[PDB]
Amino acid sequence: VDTKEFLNHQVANLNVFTVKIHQIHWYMRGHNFFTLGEKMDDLYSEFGEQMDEVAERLLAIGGSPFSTLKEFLENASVEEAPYTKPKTMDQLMEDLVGTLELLRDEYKQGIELTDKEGDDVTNDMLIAFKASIDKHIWMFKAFLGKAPLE
Amino acid sequence: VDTKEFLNHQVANLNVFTVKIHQIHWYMRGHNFFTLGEKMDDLYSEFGEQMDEVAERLLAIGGSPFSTLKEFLENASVEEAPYTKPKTMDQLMEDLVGTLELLRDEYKQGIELTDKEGDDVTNDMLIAFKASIDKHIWMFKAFLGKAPLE
Amino acid sequence: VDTKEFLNHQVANLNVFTVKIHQIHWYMRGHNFFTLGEKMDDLYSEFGEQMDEVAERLLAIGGSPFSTLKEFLENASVEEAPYTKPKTMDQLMEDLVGTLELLRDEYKQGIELTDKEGDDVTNDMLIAFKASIDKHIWMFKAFLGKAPLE
Amino acid sequence: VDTKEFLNHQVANLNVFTVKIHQIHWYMRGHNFFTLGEKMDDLYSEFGEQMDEVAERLLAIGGSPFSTLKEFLENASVEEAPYTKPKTMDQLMEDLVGTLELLRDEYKQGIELTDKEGDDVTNDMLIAFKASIDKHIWMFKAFLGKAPLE
Amino acid sequence: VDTKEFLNHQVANLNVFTVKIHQIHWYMRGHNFFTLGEKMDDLYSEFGEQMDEVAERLLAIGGSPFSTLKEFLENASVEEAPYTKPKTMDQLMEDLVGTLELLRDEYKQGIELTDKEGDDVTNDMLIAFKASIDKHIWMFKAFLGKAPLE
Amino acid sequence: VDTKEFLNHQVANLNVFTVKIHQIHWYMRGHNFFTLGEKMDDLYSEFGEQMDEVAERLLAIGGSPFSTLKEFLENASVEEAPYTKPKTMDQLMEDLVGTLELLRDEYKQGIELTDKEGDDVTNDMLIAFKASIDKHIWMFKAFLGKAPLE
Amino acid sequence: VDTKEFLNHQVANLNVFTVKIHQIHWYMRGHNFFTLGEKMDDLYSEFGEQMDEVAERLLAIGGSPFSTLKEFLENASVEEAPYTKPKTMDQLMEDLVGTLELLRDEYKQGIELTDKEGDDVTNDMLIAFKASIDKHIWMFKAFLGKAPLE
Amino acid sequence: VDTKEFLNHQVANLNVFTVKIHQIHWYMRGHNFFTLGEKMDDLYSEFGEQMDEVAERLLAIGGSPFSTLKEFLENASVEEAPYTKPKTMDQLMEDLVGTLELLRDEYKQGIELTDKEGDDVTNDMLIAFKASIDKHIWMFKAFLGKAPLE
Amino acid sequence: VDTKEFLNHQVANLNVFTVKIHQIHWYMRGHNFFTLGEKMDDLYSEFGEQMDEVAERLLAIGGSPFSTLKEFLENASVEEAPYTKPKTMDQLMEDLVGTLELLRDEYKQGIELTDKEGDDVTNDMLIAFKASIDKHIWMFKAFLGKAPLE
Amino acid sequence: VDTKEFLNHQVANLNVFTVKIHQIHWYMRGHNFFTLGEKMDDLYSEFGEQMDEVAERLLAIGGSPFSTLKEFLENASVEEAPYTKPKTMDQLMEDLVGTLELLRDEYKQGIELTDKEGDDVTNDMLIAFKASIDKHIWMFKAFLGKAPLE
Amino acid sequence: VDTKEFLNHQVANLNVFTVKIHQIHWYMRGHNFFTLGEKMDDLYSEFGEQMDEVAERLLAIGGSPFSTLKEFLENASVEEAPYTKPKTMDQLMEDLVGTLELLRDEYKQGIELTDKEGDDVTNDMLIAFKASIDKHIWMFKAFLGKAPLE
Amino acid sequence: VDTKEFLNHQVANLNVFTVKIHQIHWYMRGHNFFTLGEKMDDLYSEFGEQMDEVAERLLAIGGSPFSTLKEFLENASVEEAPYTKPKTMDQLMEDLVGTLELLRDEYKQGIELTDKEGDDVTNDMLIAFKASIDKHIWMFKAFLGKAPLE
């Protein structure tokens, strides 16, 4: 793709992801409601901050970020669904994990692309984000009784 | 509309508005960039917390929060548009203020509803949010040379 | 009941509830001991804070707060029992919830009585507390796997 | 006399009360000098914050706050007098308490008036102020060896 | 006796003391209202933490803490009475100092017992509270114009 | 005028100035509403503290500070006027600067006078106040597009 | 054994325990991953401070602390095994708990030895550590659904 | 004298004053025990820092500070006496005030001497300490029911 | 031409740039004085920090940083000139943005150079600084009414 | 070697280094006792943190950290030796510097290996650790009277 | 002797020591001036807390503290000498170590005295102080290159 | 030379001195690397503040500060030389002391000139700076084994 198009795509993804995290926090039940609820507050903030960093970096290389729900929905590859059928804590975490893995695999594409375009700053930004995602993956997989790449 | 429906309606509104605040921040230019930039981060957080409290209050009365972009679009009275043709710092603050006014008047309806249904907590919450909106309306109107209600 | 009596009745209830929260903390066992332990410490502080405000509000409208364990036992509707034969972490939490639901329903009576008697301050006080009690019933019921209003 | 004129009247009162808090602080003698001097500091700040929130609230409903000593003098119901004759600390705390009594009764009038006008925010602001005043009235009455309403 | 019984006996005493500290706070009147009320707040926190630590130590050695108002009244040697007739500040302080004296002396008894049973931790815990108590006795008797042990 | 008369005179001035700072905060409009609003909050509290220090120093030399709005008005050389026509942000800043220059020039008189009377503490205090005033003059003249002394 | 060799034996014990706490943190899985993860960070820090204090007290009486993995291994009574077979959260905490039990019983012997030698400072340091170990034992055992001394 | 001997003379005085502040704090009795206790801690700290500053200034200008109790006693104009007969708070507070007046009056001599000799740093340091001493004379005189100078 | 040469060149540049940030703070006039003035304080610290990190990195790889104004002047590519002719706020910020662009482009060279010599640490330090520079180029261009890559 | 075995090898090395830092601190003597003690506290904490991140990163890529003293000693290239004979400050710090140099050199191989395997995140973690190591070698060598590569 | 006289005796010792720590600070010269003057500032404060605690414990047991320089000189075994002949940093430190050693050995006597009197609180305090004294003896002897007990 | 030219001359000096403090920090070797390194940090920010205060004061009396390297070099009396051949810590500290002595002597000319011109603010600021310089001169002179004035 190009670097601008990549970052914008992640602007949309991250605004979908952030609303999903609220969905999980609002609808979760079970013995881990307090501990996992506060984990989702923290996740909400961090993913809000990555989103800002992506948008502001795109601004800084001369692009124009998506800035409506309509545009996020039209461009996100991260998926959402309304909450209807009760979902277990394990199933919410599995959804969360699925999304983190999706962002991990797309950032890895952004990392390669951005090395080929010689955009050293955006490259480095995306790698620091992947470092945090990879650590979240291990922890939530561990919560689900699984190994990180299982 | 009953109390549950009012509140969910505001959950959607606030998510549209929050994303709007980011639009104003991302795309603002001119001599006031720095000082309205900081004010927009402040508004982003304040309305983010408002949206959280509205959702948790709805949860606490037996209701089910809207929790996806598509649901927020389907139900929001707050309007958004993509940023296409440049806009002045004044033009952006006027959309901001125009959206604040919308929320003020709709919170006023929620306050009356909620008082007739005898829901004293939701009533109190809505008032304190209004006190803040009234103050922001006075301040951003002063920024544009105008009296609050004028 | 007049406002002074209603306020004094809650001084009693809250000094009983306060001791009950320590009972739960001290005796609780099972996989949720740490997170529920910290949550009991927060509830303890918070409800002793309420109690203090209740008594101070009673003092300021010219009343005389109960001020002995015996007076609290004589006047409370919140019940206690000594801990004898083990109960599980669901059983202690259901007892907790039951008591929050009693303080909510009684606070609602106090709200109405206080409105009728034109005491705006005590009214506002009580409503603010019910906001917090309502939040706690939602949260603690989500922990138990159930909806807020059961 | 409507909400705007009531708020404006309190701007004048609170500026007179504030300067009377300095007069007491400056002229006090006796064994309680240090602990009541510190009390007057806290009261000076607290009452300077009410004044600000009152003037900001009047601005937010479209009014114009009095903004000169001359204007506070033409309009205040709170009385002041030059410090010609030394007084005991008890007599100074009687004058203090008599002014808090005046402000409580006046805010009561504004509370009823602002409920009749459906100004929910100004109403709620004034109740919160009345709660703090009633607490100070209990305390300074206790300092003087009397009950709150006496 | 034995150590566990002695600790439980103090769980009951400290809960009664703590309610008595509140009693003195709520009802005191006279020139020392502010400083002494402040001090009662400090004593209230300090003795409540003393009580948790007594209860947790009891838990740590296989005990079962008293955990009701009923059980505290049945086992406490600390005496409580309802407030009816007005009391001086001095008279309230003489009650406070006499209760502090009674806990000191039961603690010395407890320190000797726990020495003989070889419970080093519980012995150390009790020596440290007697340090604080002894300090409070000197300080409050000084407030009353008296030596610490006259 | 001797040292005590001079200090008393500035107690009156500073109470007038402090109210003028509020008038400027409350009635200000235009693009610098936010940044200038915070500057008057800082000025308000700085000049309140100058006033407290002037008064306490008048006390410490055997003086008796003016302590009513009536005395402040009767003795102050600083002028006030009711807010009747809306003013420019520039015009309001010219009234601020104009008042700062008056205080600067008068303090210069107090500094010579107090040097002549050999009162070294009052001399020192007044010189530290002048330093801060001279800096406020540069900065606000700079804000107005001007050099400090033209 | 004299005091020196005892304290040195705990330098080695503590170095093995501390690496064991890391083993538990790194390999834990299941629903208590998040709550116990943070608990192991706290236990890691607390037991690393115990060891510093043990070594410094050994240095202050003229001893010479073990200072290699090799010597810690040759002298520790605490045992380690490499992680191979998967283990439950429950098995890991039982290892943790058994190991705390070992430390408690060895310190009880150091408290006797150290009293017989007349070394009052080391005795006191050892009693404080035992206090904290015993509290930890009650707590982790309660997480496991058992009483402290079972 | 000269500047070096003057500073050394005050090093001695301040060490005699600071032990007196402890004496007043240790022997004080009566209703003001708690509040005056706290002011004695603050004066001790403040007068201790003033001493270090005087001694380090003495060093900066090439002098050699008195550094023993024997030299302090041999050089100080400040008097001390052992505490034998009982003394009231007032009597304790009047020795405190008499001592500040002496330090004030000697600092005044040192100020004049330091002006003649051209030591502008020492001159300014002495003036700042007299500002605080003057303020303390005002406050403790006022605690005694007296004007600062008469 | 090698890593050491480049890093030293930037030590020279950053010391010229820093003094230019001061020239801008000291001479700026107009309505943005307060907000741009604070912005220069922050840039001043942040480029001083960068300079130290460049100096420390040169030192870490065996170099000898320039350490005199004479050396900075002879070696710098950033330009300076005495402030003589009046400059507009915009004109000063264009000079800033211009100097920022020069550093961005030079850092780009150092990034490719340090890639080819295999100095990964210096490479990564340079990438991090350019990220911050690119963002300030965006923000200041936006203050000027302009796209970042204009 | 792959990434996983490199990282595990450093888990081993970092647990040996950390214990050697303690050896240095505990056996420090001379004029440098306080300055070097402090610096060793800081280095212990830093290398402790470094270790956790190495372990956690290995966990995140599907590996299995060494987790016993036994495996650390079996796998480590960093050497240790018992303190059987007194050594100088200089010998202890030369050891420190040489161990730092080995870690730099091996991390340099890991940076090359992770680059070749396309592990962007690990590569970047390792480069930031080298930045700090290179800076500690400069500083600790400057302390010994030598240039960084001498 | 008895506990009261042993405590007074140390009130005199600590007062002599505190002044002595100041002498070391003030007259100290050479390469260790900064690294050791900071440690003298800590030792000053620390032995100031100790002296307070001794004095207040004496008061709490019915004693009457020495409270004049004269009384401290009459009663102390810690010796002081005026500074005339210059001294090595070595010499001043040796006199420091020698004085801490005296204090250690007199506290050892107080500990025994206080065990045989049954004063459990005073005993514990004296042990806590000797702990810190032992540490200081070791650290300062390490700084001089001696082992703690040669 | 007048007050303006003196102040501008010190803007030049302070910029050379601040860069000399960096030269000292960067090239220092030996046993005080860490402790003096940190003193150079404190000094760097302290004379940086002095410079800002001198420039802002010059601004506030209608002056125009030098604001380029070329101007500072042309005007300064403080000397600098490039770091070529190696220098001891003492030699570095003598260069530092010699420069502080120069500033002290020049500031004393500015103290006199500024007294003759009736500029009280600038006079007081310069005395405060001399007070700090004199303190530094004693401490660094003592480091070197010398008396302040020799």
Side-chain angles (χ1 to χ4, degrees), chain G residues 1-137:
Chain G
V1 287
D2 52 33
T3 290
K4 282 174 187 162
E5 284 184 5
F6 175 80
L7 244 20
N8 221 353
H9 189 267
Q10 305 310 327
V11 177
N13 271 356
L14 262 1
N15 269 276
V16 186
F17 180 36
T18 250
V19 162
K20 186 194 286 298
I21 289 172
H22 270 335
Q23 168 182 280
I24 287 167
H25 191 97
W26 294 339
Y27 287 105
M28 94 202 338
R29 292 204 197 138
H31 290 289
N32 308 100
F33 182 81
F34 291 105
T35 184
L36 256 45
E38 288 155 8
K39 237 76 229 315
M40 300 302 90
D41 291 324
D42 296 352
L43 226 47
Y44 191 68
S45 309
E46 186 191 354
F47 280 82
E49 255 99 273
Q50 274 206 14
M51 183 247 288
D52 289 340
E53 252 160 46
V54 151
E56 279 173 5
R57 180 61 187 153
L58 180 56
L59 256 353
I61 64 184
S64 318
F66 298 129
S67 69
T68 49
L69 282 75
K70 201 221 219 218
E71 305 154 286
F72 300 149
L73 258 173
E74 301 165 325
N75 300 100
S77 51
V78 168
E79 293 175 351
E80 46 166 48
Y83 196 83
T84 53
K85 261 159 287 310
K87 281 191 170 304
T88 58
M89 176 66 59
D90 257 67
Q91 288 164 254
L92 288 175
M93 298 293 92
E94 241 120 30
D95 197 19
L96 197 230
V97 159
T99 283
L100 285 178
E101 292 182 332
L102 183 156
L103 287 170
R104 170 204 55 202
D105 300 334
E106 296 194 352
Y107 284 32
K108 177 65 213 106
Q109 299 192 145
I111 286 155
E112 308 163 72
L113 171 72
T114 230
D115 180 42
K116 304 218 125 218
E117 296 189 356
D119 185 359
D120 302 289
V121 171
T122 307
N123 184 260
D124 183 72
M125 182 196 66
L126 263 13
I127 288 170
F129 293 175
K130 200 189 157 269
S132 172
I133 292 167
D134 280 340
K135 186 163 127 128
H136 280 311
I137 284 156

Side-chain angles (χ1 to χ4, degrees), chain H residues 15-51:
Chain H
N15 284 260
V16 178
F17 182 28
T18 223
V19 167
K20 186 194 286 277
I21 284 150
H22 266 347
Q23 166 178 277
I24 291 165
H25 181 107
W26 292 338
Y27 290 97
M28 80 197 355
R29 288 193 195 158
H31 288 198
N32 292 115
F33 171 96
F34 287 109
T35 179
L36 262 50
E38 268 162 50
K39 293 306 285 17
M40 297 301 107
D41 280 330
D42 295 342
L43 251 57
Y44 184 74
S45 280
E46 178 181 11
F47 284 88
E49 228 279 294
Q50 196 175 115
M51 193 259 285

Side-chain angles (χ1 to χ4, degrees), chain H residues 23 27 52 65 67 69 80, chain K residues 22-23 27 64-65 67 69 80:
Chain H
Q23 166 178 277
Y27 290 97
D52 228 315
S67 67
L69 290 65
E80 51 168 41
Chain K
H22 267 303
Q23 179 177 270
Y27 287 102
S64 294
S67 63
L69 276 68
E80 52 164 34

